């Protein structure tokens, strides 16, 4: 339990949950919903401190870009835009206000899409924003510091 | 009151040496000419609301220097001039008689810009 940094609760679309909130919650639909996530398909994925949460959903959000059918513009355009800006987030090539900017477009493609993949993409990044916010700030701080 | 003002600061306008009672016998006159007008007239109720009311302090307070800020109407030598136009105006709508309904309703939707 010490090692695990966060856990994908029930599916890739479901926002990942860290140890801070998942210390007691029951894996049920109702408790997951109030945990700002969903049980979905009960696809629990454990991940420790050694792995970086940004690189974790980096491959996840890259897979989402590799899937979107492109029918409705929010999923066709936003998800790829999400991939590019988040690729910078892996190294940290963004200012602190970009997380709010990333949050904004995450709300923009949430619900506005024809299907639920578009919001299915919003939830994982949205959960990452709300939980590992200081991690993003310090990762970006290291980005500017090492590339001064 | 006090020493008579040499000039009122407006050319053409002259300093009247007896301003308080000049306001008095002017202000009675609009009240007099207002008598002809009907009671239901909107003019009359507004007239008497500011005529004898503002006839109040000028009747009571005799110092025109304090009377400047009693009416917030500027210098007294043009207030009596302004009272003159009100007496003049009262004669004007003794003929206009505007409390009838509209002479003509606005033809179709001429207003309501833009077109």
């Amino acid at each position: 339990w010490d090692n695990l940094l966060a856990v994908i609760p029930g599916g890739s679309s479901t926002p990942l949950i860290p140890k801070s909130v998942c210390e007691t919650v029951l894996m049920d639909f109702d408790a997951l919903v109030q945990a700002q996530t969903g049980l979905g398909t009960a696809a629990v994925i454990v991940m420790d401190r050694s792995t970086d949460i940004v690189k974790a959903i980096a491959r996840l959000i890259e897979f989402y870009k590799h899937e979107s059918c492109g029918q409705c513009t929010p999923c066709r355009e936003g998800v790829d835009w999400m991939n590019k800006v988040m690729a910078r987030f892996v190294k940290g090539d963004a200012r602190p206000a970009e997380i709010d900017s990333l949050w904004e477009i995450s709300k923009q493609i949430e619900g506005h899409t024809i299907c639920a993949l578009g919001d299915g993409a919003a939830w994982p990044v949205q959960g990452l924003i709300r939980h590992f916010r200081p991690e993003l700030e310090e990762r970006m701080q290291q980005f500017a510091l090492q590339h001064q | 009151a006090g020493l008579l003002k040499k000039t009122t600061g407006l050319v053409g306008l002259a300093v009247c040496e007896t301003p308080h009672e000049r306001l008095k016998i002017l202000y009675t006159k609009i009240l007099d000419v207002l008598g002809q007008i009907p009671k239901n007239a909107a003019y009359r109720k507004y007239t008497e609301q500011i005529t004898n009311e503002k006839l109040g302090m000028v009747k009571a307070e005799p110092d025109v220097k304090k009377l400047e800020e009693q009416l917030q109407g500027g210098q007294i030598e043009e207030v009596i001039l302004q009272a003159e136009n009100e007496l003049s105006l009262a004669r004007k709508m003794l003929r206009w008689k505007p409390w009838e309904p509209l002479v003509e309703e606005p033809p179709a939707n001429q207003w309501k810009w833009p077109i």
Binding site: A97, D100 | K45, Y46, I50, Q72, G74, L102
Partner: protein
């Protein structure tokens, strides 16, 4: 500037004032014509955080003239409070 103190004296006495203090022409006091490149600021709403145009809709927020009376006890008012007699300029009242 060039001008010797002799006729400088002639200008000063005839004009009743010293003109060498300030002259109608220009000299080295003028900023040179190769000023460094500027870094003009950005807009107040240039942030990439919440900046939706749905907030600032200056053209859109305008409303038609408000209907108050149409052809189709009371008190007397004024369109504004009567003006206030401003006082003299404390710096210099009478020219």
């Amino acid at each position: 500037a060039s001008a010797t103190r002799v006729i400088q004296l002639l200008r000063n006495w005839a004009s009743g004032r010293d003109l060498q203090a300030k002259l109608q022409l220009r000299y080295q006091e003028i900023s040179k014509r190769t000023q460094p490149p500027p870094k003009l600021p950005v807009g107040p709403s240039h942030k990439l955080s919440n900046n939706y145009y749905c907030t600032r809709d200056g053209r859109r927020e305008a409303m038609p003239p408000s209907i108050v009376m149409s052809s189709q006890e009371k008190k007397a008012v004024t369109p504004a409070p009567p003006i206030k007699r401003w006082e003299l300029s404390k710096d210099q009242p009478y020219l």
